[PDB]
Amino acid sequence: MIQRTPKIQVYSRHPAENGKSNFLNCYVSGFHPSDIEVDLLKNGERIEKVEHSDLSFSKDWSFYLLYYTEFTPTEKDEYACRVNHVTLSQPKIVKWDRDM
Amino acid sequence: GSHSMRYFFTSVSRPGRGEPRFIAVGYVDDTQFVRFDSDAASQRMEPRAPWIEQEGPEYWDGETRKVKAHSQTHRVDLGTLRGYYNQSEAGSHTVQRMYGCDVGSDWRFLRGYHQYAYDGKDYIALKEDLRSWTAADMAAQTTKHKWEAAHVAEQLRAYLEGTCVEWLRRYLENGKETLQRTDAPKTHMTHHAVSDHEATLRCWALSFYPAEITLTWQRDGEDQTQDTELVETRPAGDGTFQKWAAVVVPSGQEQRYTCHVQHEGLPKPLTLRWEP
Amino acid sequence: SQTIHQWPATLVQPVGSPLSLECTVEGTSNPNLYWYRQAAGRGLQLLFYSVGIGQISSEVPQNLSASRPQDRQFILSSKKLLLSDSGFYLCAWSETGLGTGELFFGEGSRLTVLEDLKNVFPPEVAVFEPSEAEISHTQKATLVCLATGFYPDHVELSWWVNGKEVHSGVCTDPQPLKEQPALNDSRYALSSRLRVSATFWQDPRNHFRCQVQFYGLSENDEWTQDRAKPVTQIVSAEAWGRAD
Amino acid sequence: AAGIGILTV
Amino acid sequence: QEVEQNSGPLSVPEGAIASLNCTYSDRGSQSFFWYRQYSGKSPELIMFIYSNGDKEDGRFTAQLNKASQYVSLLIRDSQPSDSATYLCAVNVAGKSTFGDGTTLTVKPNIQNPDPAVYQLRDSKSSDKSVCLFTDFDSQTNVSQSKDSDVYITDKCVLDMRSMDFKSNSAVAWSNKSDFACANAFNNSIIPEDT
């Protein structure tokens, strides 16, 4: 058996334009087994309308999903992605970096 | 360019609540184009790019029949392998399969492959010669014997070298708009200095296809730099990809570093100094 | 057939009757199962196919229903039959998955549906003894057997000799002939010939039975005719030899 | 999606 | 039209090479089969094949040509027992679709015909009887009766391993007020009755 803890990236489809529509992606990958909670967060409060790519894998059999929502970003708002998986002791939270 | 189509199968067992979840998905190059989910209502093989809805109902029936059958062999396997690995009925195990075609710039057959994993680890996979089998352990060895007996390689070779490639060409021909497109990257730089002496430079590249890329930091002179960050290429969500490579330098000499970029949609490779 | 057995072999049924054909398989598991049909003209047509227990799939919009309560028990059936549903029905199985496609077949259920059972008649059988000439000219002995007047046209002629079934020397017609060539529901004749050497027809204790299995009405089938119910039966005829 | 060569294990 | 296969009876002489052919539309066809089906029997696999070339098993040879989209079957040195319907099947998308089948008839030929017509008399009584036209060459043929209150059967092939003798037999009979054995229909010069 192998478990593999997931990598996470959270980021915007296009450059952060404050008050113009866009999509925020939380991209998890490199992980195994495939069962995996991922929630997207607007200031800690969960976002319901989230979407997720069909699951595929890599040459090392590791999974990769793309969660995403439509969002208009603002100056004052911190979005963050919440992932839990058997490999994690508790849920990892990754805050969205404007230009990372 | 070189081109590939691939299918990925996954079956997790859910002992005590339902039959194994089964998820199939298909790709040409870095583009997804069909799928199946044992839990989706439709219970068919569904389309996932424009150029595939073109195909008639004879197709969809066909691919469904095919995919369901995969599903079943995976449902049995999950059982067999418990036996072989002497595992209990409680708790869930994954089985994964993946095969496909590559073709060179001439669209001729280049190489074939077909591999099978269990609980995330390689179990049995078909060598490049499309004839022999590598096997992990005494369980895999059991199967290798079974599959040698039934000439599973010979049957597979047929598909891989024959029909799989034929269809990839058919798709590449219908897909032109999408599959042979080659979007060049939109790139910018970003100067985030850790105060005083530090300074790091992120060499962004957005909106490209396909995902194969190469961005590499240079000094004026010798090329390579090992002391540099970069993130795995990531899906934009709209069909393109994103990547960047950061590196750290002094808050003097900012403009003596140049970030070369190599993509298949760029005639000449790009290069980038610091702006101001 | 060691691997897949199917029944009933043969059915004559009036329109609007119920149908149920059963199919069993032994010696593999999680097999693909198939119901095919050989309608008016010898091409196999796929009716139902199944990936595994409790999973069915129909190909042509159909009157019939099929089901599978068990990994290896396959049932095709119908509420009210139509004329259309006459045919040869073949159960088949293939190896779990998508192997070479090889299909293994049942022995087949042959279904005739009729508008009117009053048309049904078993065969008159007769066996005719070889001529005194044929023994002199050729020292050989052709015994003809003649089933006549039966309907419908499935019957199975069989040669028997001193208690045992014999195949060598036999020639049964490849299929039978209308008695009223110009008439819709005519009855049929069929002829077989055993041929044995002179010294056998000369009887040291020799006994020849011509025997015809006929497939016809079954018990419980509304019959309103003055004559006895023409059910599945074996009609047969006899001869003993002769030192001229 | 292959048509043949896909057997169990 | 998905899978095409000439039907009508092909006839080949005993010991010649029989050749059957099959055609198929859908290009993505994975594997290919000849089954054989005996009269009133379920069908039964001669051969399968799934890449271009030739595959031989004894007297049988399959030929596939994915480019031209045809599968052939040749039968070497044909026996009378090879008379059968030969169904062609093409497995696409996890379902084998079938031709309407081609029907083959291997005519024996007889080393030495002793053509003849005898009258066989009913064991059970004198009055009833029939006529047998026997021991003729397969080149000669037997034709259906007009004024059909007299019934004649087509020929039927007889294989007594016994002595090395195959006979060709056809039979005719009637309810009519005695028309004896004399119905002229394309036979050869042959012995007679008293």
Side-chain angles (χ1 to χ4, degrees), chain C residues 2 18 34 37 145 151 175 180 185 218 222 236 238:
Chain C
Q2 249 259 315
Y34 299 98
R37 167 152 149 270
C145 179
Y151 179 96
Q175 99 281 236
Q180 329 287 297
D185 41 31
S218 42
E222 289 167 290
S236 31
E238 271 201 350

Side-chain angles (χ1 to χ4, degrees), chain C residues 1 34 36 38 41-46 49 59 88 90 98-108 126-135 137-138 140 142-144 146-148 154 167-175 177-181 189-197 237-239, chain E residues 31 33 35 37-45 48 50 84-85 87 89 91 93-101 103 114-116 118-124 128-132 134-135 145 148 151-163 165-167 169-171 173 191-193:
Chain C
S1 266
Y34 299 98
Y36 275 91
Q38 221 182 185
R42 199 141 270 214
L44 281 270
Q45 176 183 51
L46 179 67
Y49 71 91
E59 242 68 15
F88 195 46
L90 284 156
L98 270 9
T100 72
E102 167 157 28
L103 257 5
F104 307 95
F105 277 111
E107 41 279 276
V127 21
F128 301 66
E129 310 192 326
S131 89
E132 189 173 336
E134 196 198 346
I135 297 93
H137 201 308
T138 73
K140 283 180 170 81
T142 296
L143 304 60
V144 160
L146 207 51
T148 81
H154 205 325
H167 301 293
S168 186
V170 170
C171 192
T172 312
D173 289 350
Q175 99 281 236
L177 81 79
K178 278 201 174 180
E179 289 195 322
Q180 329 287 297
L190 185 84
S191 62
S192 187
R193 328 77 153 95
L194 190 50
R195 196 179 227 208
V196 308
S197 76
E238 271 201 350
Chain E
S31 59
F33 306 77
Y35 294 88
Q37 190 177 221
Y38 284 124
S39 174
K41 250 73 181 145
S42 83
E44 139 209 67
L45 181 50
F48 69 61
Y50 52 86
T85 303
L87 285 43
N91 181 37
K95 99 182 187 190
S96 318
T97 310
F98 273 83
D100 295 10
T103 285
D114 190 350
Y118 312 78
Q119 101 136 207
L120 288 65
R121 182 200 278 286
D122 177 16
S123 67
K124 266 58 169 61
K128 267 184 135 291
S129 89
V130 291
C131 313
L132 171 56
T134 188
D135 298 5
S145 163
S148 205
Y151 309 113
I152 91 154
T153 66
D154 197 37
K155 47 163 151 148
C156 170
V157 58
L158 208 156
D159 179 52
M160 54 186 306
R161 343 296 158 70
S162 314
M163 73 162 287
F165 206 143
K166 305 177 182 153
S167 280
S169 351
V171 82
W173 78 90
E192 235 51 80
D193 305 352

Side-chain angles (χ1 to χ4, degrees), chain A residues 45-62:
Chain A
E45 204 87 72
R46 178 214 73 257
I47 305 196
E48 234 307 64
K49 186 165 278 182
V50 162
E51 300 273 27
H52 74 290
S53 85
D54 314 303
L55 98 166
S56 176
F57 50 79
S58 302
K59 38 267 145 103
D60 65 356
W61 312 104
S62 80

Side-chain angles (χ1 to χ4, degrees), chain A residues 6-93:
Chain A
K7 295 161 280 148
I8 305 168
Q9 309 214 48
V10 29
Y11 57 85
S12 71
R13 188 188 285 183
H14 296 266
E17 30 203 318
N18 307 64
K20 330 295 166 229
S21 208
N22 195 350
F23 289 78
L24 166 41
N25 306 310
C26 171
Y27 175 60
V28 295
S29 56
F31 72 94
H32 204 107
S34 49
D35 275 344
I36 181 162
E37 298 174 297
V38 184
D39 267 42
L40 278 181
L41 296 171
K42 190 175 174 200
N43 298 323
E45 204 87 72
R46 178 214 73 257
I47 305 196
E48 234 307 64
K49 186 165 278 182
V50 162
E51 300 273 27
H52 74 290
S53 85
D54 314 303
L55 98 166
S56 176
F57 50 79
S58 302
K59 38 267 145 103
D60 65 356
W61 312 104
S62 80
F63 295 102
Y64 73 90
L65 247 22
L66 176 60
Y67 288 84
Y68 70 113
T69 189
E70 182 149 350
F71 89 131
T72 51
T74 80
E75 289 197 280
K76 61 254 185 157
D77 282 318
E78 302 183 28
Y79 297 78
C81 177
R82 156 146 52 165
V83 163
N84 203 298
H85 190 266
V86 283
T87 45
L88 304 176
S89 83
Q90 81 194 349
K92 187 82 222 107
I93 304 299

